Amino acid sequence: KQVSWKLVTEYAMETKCDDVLLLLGMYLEFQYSFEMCLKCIKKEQPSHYKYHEKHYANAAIFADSKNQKTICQQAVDTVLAKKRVDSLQLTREQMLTNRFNDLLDRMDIMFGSTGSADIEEWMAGVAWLHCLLPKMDSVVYDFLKCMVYNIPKKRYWLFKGPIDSGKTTLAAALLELCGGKALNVNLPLDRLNFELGVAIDQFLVVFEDVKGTGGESRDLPSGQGINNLDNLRDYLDGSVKVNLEKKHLNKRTQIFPPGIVTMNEYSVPKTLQARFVKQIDFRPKDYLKHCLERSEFLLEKRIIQSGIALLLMLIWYRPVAEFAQSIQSRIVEWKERLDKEFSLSVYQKMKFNVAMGIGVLD
Amino acid sequence: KQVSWKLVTEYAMETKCDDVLLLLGMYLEFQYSFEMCLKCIKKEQPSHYKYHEKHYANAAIFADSKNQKTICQQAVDTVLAKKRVDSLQLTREQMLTNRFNDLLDRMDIMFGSTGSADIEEWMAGVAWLHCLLPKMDSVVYDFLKCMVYNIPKKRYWLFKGPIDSGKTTLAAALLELCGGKALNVNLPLDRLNFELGVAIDQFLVVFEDVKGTGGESRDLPSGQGINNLDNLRDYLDGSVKVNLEKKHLNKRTQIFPPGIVTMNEYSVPKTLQARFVKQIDFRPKDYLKHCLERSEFLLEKRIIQSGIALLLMLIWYRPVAEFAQSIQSRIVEWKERLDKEFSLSVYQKMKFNVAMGIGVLD
Amino acid sequence: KQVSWKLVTEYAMETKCDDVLLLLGMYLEFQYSFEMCLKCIKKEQPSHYKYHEKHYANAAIFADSKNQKTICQQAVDTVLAKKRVDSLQLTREQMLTNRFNDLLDRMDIMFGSTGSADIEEWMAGVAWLHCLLPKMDSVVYDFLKCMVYNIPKKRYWLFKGPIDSGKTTLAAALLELCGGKALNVNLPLDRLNFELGVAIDQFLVVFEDVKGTGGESRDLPSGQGINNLDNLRDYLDGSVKVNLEKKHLNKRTQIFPPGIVTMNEYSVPKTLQARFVKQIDFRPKDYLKHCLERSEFLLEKRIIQSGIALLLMLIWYRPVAEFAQSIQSRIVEWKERLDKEFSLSVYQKMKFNVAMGIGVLD
Amino acid sequence: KQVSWKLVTEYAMETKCDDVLLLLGMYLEFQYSFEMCLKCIKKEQPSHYKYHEKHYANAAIFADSKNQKTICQQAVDTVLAKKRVDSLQLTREQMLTNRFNDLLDRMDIMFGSTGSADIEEWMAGVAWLHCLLPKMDSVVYDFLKCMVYNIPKKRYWLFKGPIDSGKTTLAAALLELCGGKALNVNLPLDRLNFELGVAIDQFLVVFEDVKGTGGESRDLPSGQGINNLDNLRDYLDGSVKVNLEKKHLNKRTQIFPPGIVTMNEYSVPKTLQARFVKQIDFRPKDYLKHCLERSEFLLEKRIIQSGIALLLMLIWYRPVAEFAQSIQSRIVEWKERLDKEFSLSVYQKMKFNVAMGIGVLD
Amino acid sequence: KQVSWKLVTEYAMETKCDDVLLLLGMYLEFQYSFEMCLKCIKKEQPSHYKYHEKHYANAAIFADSKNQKTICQQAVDTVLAKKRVDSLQLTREQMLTNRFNDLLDRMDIMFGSTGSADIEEWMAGVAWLHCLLPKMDSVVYDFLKCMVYNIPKKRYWLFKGPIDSGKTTLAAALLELCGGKALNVNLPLDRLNFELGVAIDQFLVVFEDVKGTGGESRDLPSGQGINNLDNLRDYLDGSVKVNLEKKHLNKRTQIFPPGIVTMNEYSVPKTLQARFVKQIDFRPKDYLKHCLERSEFLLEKRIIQSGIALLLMLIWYRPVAEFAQSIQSRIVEWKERLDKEFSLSVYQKMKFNVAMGIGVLD
Ligand SMILES: [Zn+2]
Ligand SMILES: [Zn+2]
Ligand SMILES: [Zn+2]
Ligand SMILES: [Zn+2]
Ligand SMILES: [Zn+2]
């Protein structure tokens, strides 16, 4: 009779779906009676089995509409219209809490009744990560406060180290823990601005492997990335706003996002150095490598690079009140979960096993 | 049933909202009953709580409308249309007063009971800023008269100074007080029109850190800024109109905007120098530097580079009749609030502190 | 009167038809009575005769409809939408089984009573192919497990060999058995992203004939392939996601696909070599060469490079349980047909022939 | 009342019209009573006088429609939708037969009651062509079987010869006899792919005048075309499919089409040579030139370059059963036509006249 | 109420109006009553006064129509559609007669009672032009026959001469008499296709001032024209079709148009020279030069370079039967008017004047 465009927009806003084709393809699965849906019975996809029921009726009418895409276009624009509002209205801590909430939804399913994730292998990831840097759980908390506070000339951390030292991994988990885009400044001074535009609306940015000049004697390729950063002081310390680009034309004007610079031991100009409020030197450690050699699951399952392993470390080490009021109920809920499955002496042993480089789970 | 396109346009026009996705996002939040509206109950957004009730009805119908996007378009074209009308019809002073009303709009909120802004700190900034130059409030006033009057060969100021000397800060605060855009002219003589086109319809312009080839011994980079500036004499003194490029074509033909040129102490050709009606030299001052070290909040909350700090200086030093008739009543309103809050002896101790380099609030 | 958009979409969805002009072309052939339909009477096209009757009615109305094109669009967006859904929700094994069902779909037709394919010849290809490498069926199986498992640093195979050595053939057959795209990386270090973007949503990738600067004496060209590969270590071992360029912008962010690298015997940097979990060397064999000279049909009917030849090898050598539960019944169906058609002693004489270099069917 | 979009699509599909403007302009000529049409009475254009009658009525209503182009747009898309189907469904021999049928329609009018063509001048063209190469009629048949069979590593012929030797002419008639696009590989390695995309959906391709390096001593310009061909082995012998481009993005992936390479006597690398299954050396012959000097009509009327002269040679020399069943009825029909107007001794004399270089028709 | 789209299309078709904005502009002038129409009363525009009355009614309704633009579109597509039809169906002579009718259309107006053209002056031009070359009217006639016949290797004329020698003038007059475009080939060998594409659907072409590298001593520039021409032998002699580029792609495939080549006395390669069926040499003549000095009106009113001057020469010298049957009656009409206006003895004195270099009207 008359397809309800509203319900479709609701489903989209509930699934957080900003892809028109992906929305179309999912709403259409609902057109079949749920009174038999195996996707639901078998709980295949949460984005499906939690809405099929409610939307059967409307999806059945939807499958007969003459402009299903136009409808999905408005549902999507709605998700984007909201993503644009929060962009200007939400505070940074709220930005961070939403990210956090989205990661918990991911964790709720991973370690749930209908999920594959093995939490024991993920706490092993926490043990390995907490052995990568001293007072690692305090570091992540600090980093998070640095990013949310986002204060001029104190918004960037510099990860320096050889390859396979750990900065890339920690810098990756940190990225996913907060949401944000990595960028590449090892480009020609004219190709730069396009890349810099990527950081639009982002919470944080990670300048992956910035290459410098000097050090070719130590087998390190000369690049202009370091040189470009020293020319992007305005961006890094962000005291005033900046104009960002995309679509071959100027878009947003804002405070460049705070972040991390991953580097490979190139000499740094004193003017560049001064832009980093914190520096972390990573050196490859033998036991850590050996631990992995005897714990393939941490790599093959991409656990130690996952921002989830870091959120997990927080929930496990950090005091509840350190989180936002709004999300604390969900945090205590996970602490109890965790505390109920792992004792301290068990988690501690995992850390001991890493130190001995033998296999977290031995 | 029958959504009102004019009611949405009203909302857009009173929010000065030129963003479609944003307008859409804002409006859809009014579909919910405002009775138990927390956003209103907590008064978290002026652009929301001030209009939710009046638009509840309309928004609720808008929610079930099939072309929400199209409705928002017309509302935005109406706002762009109004801005196109002011570009061609308001006097520069009417342009400056609207800008002032807008900043004031923020001040009511920042310093309101919902805002988080500390007015003592923003007055600490007036004091610090008032120690950056001799007779600073008169310096600001003149600039303003200069910009509004926009008179041939007497519309450009040259801020010359080392680094961390204040020119960047004052040029930034001035940029925000009047509206306008910063421009980079240290570019390829052909990738110039690109940037010069950003000046379209802008009130004033600021060429930041113009660099010259001449000079190098004193540690100053190359850049072609000075060079380029000398080839834009017609844009600078504005005796006749000019053709500005944007959208990768020739849009607006207008008198190029007045403004400032920030520079780092190079050799300025006589022909270029003759283009500036006034030139200010900034030399690093220890007390101002030490003072910041002890007055972190000035930089951390981006106060000294705010056009709001400067608007507070005019309201605090200058007489009412100096403002546009249309706004005075609002200024007087502020003077009183301010005079009720700070004694001249208090404000004076503040400048004394900056003078002794010890943080304004001691 | 009132054409059914859903009936056309059904037709499009069951033909996996993503082409609009093509869908339109197909559907308009159903407007004619199927009673005296020669295309059906002669069963010349599965995508036609299998659906003509069910769609006669609809097609006849479609013929007098004013927006046939628009109808076809939605039907295509529905198919693209389904493909967008599988990209994000199927496991790699479910991806491999669909691919297998499709190839099987062809096999039913090629070897059917309407097809022109000689099954003895395609079994001559299994034999020839089974003489190209030791334990070839186990080699194929592993690759498959490798690709499906897509595990960090253990997802790339290196096919190294001269020319006319078999690597090109096997890499082509393997490419068709799993789906995927061939890629050329011997390009300008900037005209690279272009090609790397072709890997988007693909199941596996094949970098064909990667060339290196090192080496030249032995008559091998220059090319920058090896060079480039070494700069794509992150795309190869797939520990973390990557941003792929297509449409002249940044589309999909995904784990780069697993695959093969075909190479012509250059010097492979240790850092690059460490990127391949397995390496196969192909050396020209006389009997295989002579055998082709006498087994023209193998090359002339493009059989040895077919993924169909290889699917026939798995069905012929491998046990049922090795296949996905969902498909086995169809394989068993084929095994029987095959076992009823060829005796092991016959197939063995075939390999003996390839061994003596005299054409498989003597 | 209501314009019949269907009839318009039928006319378009009957005229094989894929040009919207050309369709619009022709359907509109039908709006006038045919009961007086001089275009019909005078039989000016077959595309007009064979449909005016049937379409008057509908064209009269058409001339009053408010969106004649939208209608013509669907008629066209229909012709393209069909051209796309046959692209995937028709066999190569059917592809060739359709071409053949289209050439007969052209010949039916040329030598008909309302046509200008003089068949005697066209049989003179056949006599001249059959004197250009030994057993010429067997050559064309062979070439046609080579093209239809389209077998890997046996799909290309190489025409080598000085200028005005005859390869260009024969290669042109062959092109038109089969339908297909010529391409130019004498382009920069980066401009290549654009050109190569032209061969999409084509029956055959003709690489016109490929220039090499070496031979500048014999007054031959150095080019990179030969060099590019040796880099297009995959394309030439076509054992596996290839990706083709257009519209600045990737389109079809298919077996590159078979064809001819016209060359000017440059040395050929043994690796390139091996790609041509046949080579034909053309040497300018005196009597042939003299014959033309005394037979201007063969050139001024473009007869010896016309694919029609070749189809005519076939019908005249070849046995009916050598053609496809479907088209034989039409072939015997032309043989009788021909046999009724030209005796063997007459045609033979024409061949004798060419040999003597004096004028086919003397 | 209900505007007629066909009536507007009629207006567009009879004005040969291919401009949308222009058509719209013209039509809206008919909405006003034609009773007191001054434009009609004063007969200032044929494209106006000749149709105002018949369209008053329609135009008045058109004025209140909501989609005037869309109506005009169809009317223009109808005119473009007609032109697309003539491109493919008229004989070159029918093309030349339409062109002649059009120029004649102007002549009726220029020399009418509303026009400002002095016919004595335009006959002064025939005389001057008739002294520029021996047997000029026969020279014009031949060119015309040449162009219409468009016969292989006999379609290009070479106008070779110094400067101010007449070649430019005659080539311009000839260009206007037949229709066509001027082309610049002294360009980059890659920015050539651009210009060559302008020849699309044109009747004849004129390569103006082709320059050669050879030669320089005699004060002649460089340019690559001659060079390029020699690489376009296939475009020049038109034995086979060619692919022309426009819209930045490959549009029309056609026989390249016939025409003239204007040149300034360089060295023309034999291979290039063989491309011209006729070559005319222009050498500066004093009397012709002096004559202009005293016959300013010839240059000032752009008469000697007009195709109208030349059409007047054919009507004045040539016999009726030489024209197309379809137009003769109109020519005879003109001959009489002309013979009634000028005696042969008068016209002869005119040539005598040009001969003595003293202005034709003395
Ligand atoms: Zn379901
Ligand atoms: Zn509210
Ligand atoms: Zn059928
Ligand atoms: Zn007719
Ligand atoms: Zn009028």
Curated annotation (Swiss-Prot), chains A, B, C, D, E:
Residue ranges of domain SF3 helicase in the record: 135-295
EC number: 5.6.2.4
Written domain comment of the UniProt record: The J domain is essential for multiple viral activities, including virion assembly, viral DNA replication, transformation and transcriptional activation. The LXCXE motif specifically binds to host pRB, RBL1, and RBL2.
UniProt keywords, alphabetically: Acetylation, Activator, ATP-binding, DNA replication, DNA-binding, Early protein, G1/S host cell cycle checkpoint dysregulation by virus, Glycoprotein, Helicase, Host nucleus, Host-virus interaction, Hydrolase, Inhibition of host innate immune response by virus, Inhibition of host interferon signaling pathway by virus, Inhibition of host JAK1 by virus, Interferon antiviral system evasion, Isomerase, Magnesium, Metal-binding, Modulation of host cell cycle by virus, Modulation of host E3 ubiquitin ligases by virus, Modulation of host ubiquitin pathway by virus, Nucleotide-binding, Oncogene, Phosphoprotein, Transcription, Transcription regulation, Viral immunoevasion, Zinc, Zinc-finger
Binding site for Zn(2+): 37, 40, 48, 52
Other remarks on this protein: The sequence shown is that of strain 776.
Span of zinc fingers (T-ag D1-type): 1-92
Cofactor dependence: Mg(2+)
Cofactor binding note of this UniProt entry: DNA helicase activity requires Mg(2+).
Lineage of source species: Viruses, Monodnaviria, Shotokuvirae, Cossaviricota, Papovaviricetes
Catalytic activity as recorded in UniProt: Couples ATP hydrolysis with the unwinding of duplex DNA by translocating in the 3'-5' direction; ATP + H2O = ADP + phosphate + H(+)
Regulation: DNA helicase activity is inhibited by ATP-gamma-S.
Keyword field contains Membrane: no
Residues that, per the record, bind ATP: 161-168
Major place of residence: host cell
Keyword Lipid biosynthesis among UniProt keywords: no
GO cellular component, one term: host cell nucleus
Gene Ontology terms: biological process: bidirectional double-stranded viral DNA replication; DNA replication; symbiont-mediated perturbation of host cell cycle G1/S transition checkpoint; symbiont-mediated perturbation of host ubiquitin-like protein modification; symbiont-mediated suppression of host innate immune response; symbiont-mediated suppression of host JAK-STAT cascade via inhibition of JAK1 activity; symbiont-mediated suppression of host type I interferon-mediated signaling pathway; viral DNA genome replication
Protein's name according to its UniProt entry: Large T antigen
Its job: Isoform large T antigen is a key early protein essential for both driving viral replication and inducing cellular transformation. Plays a role in viral genome replication by driving entry of quiescent cells into the cell cycle and by autoregulating the synthesis of viral early mRNA. Displays highly oncogenic activities by corrupting the host cellular checkpoint mechanisms that guard cell division and the transcription, replication, and repair of DNA. Participates in the modulation of cellular gene expression preceeding viral DNA replication. Isoform 17kT antigen targets host RBL2 for degradation and promotes cell proliferation. Transactivates host cyclin A promoter through its J domain.
One term of GO molecular function: helicase activity
Region Binding to host TP53 protein, annotated ranges: 72-362
Compartment(s): Host nucleus
Quaternary structure note: Isoform large T antigen forms homohexamers in the presence of ATP. Interacts with host HDAC1. Interacts (via LXCXE domain) with host RB1; the interaction induces the aberrant dissociation of RB1-E2F1 complex thereby disrupting RB1's activity. Interacts (via LXCXE domain) with host pRB-related proteins RBL1 and RBL2. Interacts (via C-terminus) with host TOP1 and POLA1 allowing DNA replication. Interacts with host TP53, inhibiting TP53 binding to DNA. Interacts with host preinitiation complex components TBP, TFIIA and TFIID to regulate transcription initiation.
Modifications after synthesis and translation: Phosphorylated on both serine and threonine residues. Small t antigen inhibits the dephosphorylation by the AC form of PP2A. O-Glycosylated near the C-terminal region.
